[model samples]
Target: KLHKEPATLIKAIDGDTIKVMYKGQPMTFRLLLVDTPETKHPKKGVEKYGPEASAFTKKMVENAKKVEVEFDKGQRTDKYGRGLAYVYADGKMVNEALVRQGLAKVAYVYKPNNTHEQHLRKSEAQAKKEKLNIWS
Candidate 1:
């Protein structure tokens, strides 16, 4: 089973990452099973579709009444110290929502922890078929 805890959104770093207040502590979280274009890359600068993805993520997460973080069973955090999680807000999976809405791509496949990979891929396919945003 996955471990989940209530959290509050502080900011949306991009489509795939966010800052939240969890357990009264501010932390950064990377959404699992999805990747969005970089809005603020150090060397590469902003990529195409980056701003749209970021804006969409901000709209979904920031406007939600409640947010929760669900952890993967294997590793709790990545090497960068950001927490790995699937965020839920307003009863919707934020990670999958990004992909379903064509704001992000299914990415960063790691073994034994990608519980929603298939669902995300299917969503991406539908988004691509419809030529929505990033998929376009």
Candidate 2:
């Protein structure tokens, strides 16, 4: 089972990352099961559809009336200590939404945390079939 916690979006850094206020403190959430093109890395610079991914996430997350973080039954943090979970915005999974729109790709998957893995892959498949954004 997944654990749910309320969160307030402080900033939408990119499609796969955001800063939020959770548990009464600021936290950085590295969205699970999805990776978007780099939008702010100096060395990598901006990749294809990077701006669009960043823009879309910002619009959705920032404008969301409700936001929640769902943690799977696995390690909750990455080596960098960033929170790893599925971001739910307005009752929809933002990670899935991004991949469905082709702004993100299904990646960084590992066990027990693989609860919604299939859903993400299905979303990516449809995006790829349509040659959308990253798929194109």
Candidate 3:
């Protein structure tokens, strides 16, 4: 099923992910086509902009009602079985929003269904222009 619109109640998890209830079922979503430094990854210790990324996502999603979940070719789970999705809220794509805010980097593992590729590129470009999160 295609959720052409936004879901209600945005819940923040980290810099790049969020939890939201869809159809009465709570789902944990990892932003597709982007990757952010690990705020809570066991081995990957937090990077320079990790906290900023998390905070950015928190600000974007906190209490945001109305989000959209677009499905890809695979199921909602990633390789490790975490729910994977392309989320949007407030007429803005969540994946692109994070990148636009300098909270994430491009994740090109899945290429065919990347709807916000251009937006992501622009987002990163803006961040780089402003020197928001580039460590070096």
Candidate maximizing lDDT: 2
Candidate numbers, best TM-score first, in rank order: 2, 1, 3
Cα lDDT, all candidates = 0.88, 0.89, 0.71
Q: Show model 3 residue runs off by greater than 4 Å.
A: 1-5, 73-75
| Candidate 2, 1-136: lDDT as tens digits | 6767899999888768899999999999999988889878669988888899999888888888999999888999999879999998899888998999999988977897899999899999999999998878
Runs of candidate 1 exceeding 4 Å displacement: none
Write down the TM-score for model 1: 0.94
Candidate 1: residue 27 Cα off by (Å): 0.6
For candidate 2, list the clashing residue pairs, or say none.
none
Ranking by lDDT: 2, 1, 3
- TM-score of every model? 0.94, 0.95, 0.79
Compare candidates 2 and 3 on lDDT and give the better one: 2
Encode model 1's per-residue lDDT on 62-118: one tens digit a residue.
889989999987787999999999999887999888898888999979977688888
| Deviation in Å, model 2, residue 53 alpha carbon | 0.6
The regions of model 2 sitting more than 4 angstroms off are none
Task: Please report how far candidate 3 places residue 53 from its true position, in Å.
Answer: 1.0
User: Number of clashing residue pairs in every model?
Assistant: 0, 0, 4
